[PDB]
Amino acid sequence: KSFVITDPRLPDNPIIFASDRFLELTEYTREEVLGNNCRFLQGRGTDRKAVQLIRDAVKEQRDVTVQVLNYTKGGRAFWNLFHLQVMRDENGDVQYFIGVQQEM
Ligand SMILES: *[C@@]12=NC3=[C]C([C])=C([C])[C]=C3N([C][C]([O])[C]([O])[C]([O])[C]OP([O])([O])=O)C1=NC(=O)[N]C2=O
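Above: the input record for the complex with flavin mononucleotide. Below: its predicted structure, written as tokens.
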């Protein structure tokens, strides 16, 4: 599936891993995404009430499933059924955030 892995222990919670289907779906190149916060997929038509939720889940560090509007590198807009999950891989502490993306 399309998914990425982010490391919240780094400044701005950057994408450190992105599956191939993800790069296919967004039309970007691995060199472009890696190191960057995912928000670069949002645009003028993206609902901010949705982006607010995502922001909450992240800070509060919980799971969430939000439908958000994104734009490929080319400029084409698409619906993104986004699901968030926490890699509590630790012993309480959050180590990674896993995100699954689906063009819907
Ligand atoms: C992005 N996918 C994505 C994947 C993971 C694993 C995480 C943690 C977040 C995302 N986002 C959200 C984005 O990075 C950010 O959390 C929000 O924009 C809110 O924070 P800011 O600081 O910007 O207010 C994703 N956002 C997208 O729009 N598309 C994805 O595919």
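Notes for the reader.
The first helix runs from residue 20 to 26.
The radius of gyration is 13 Å.
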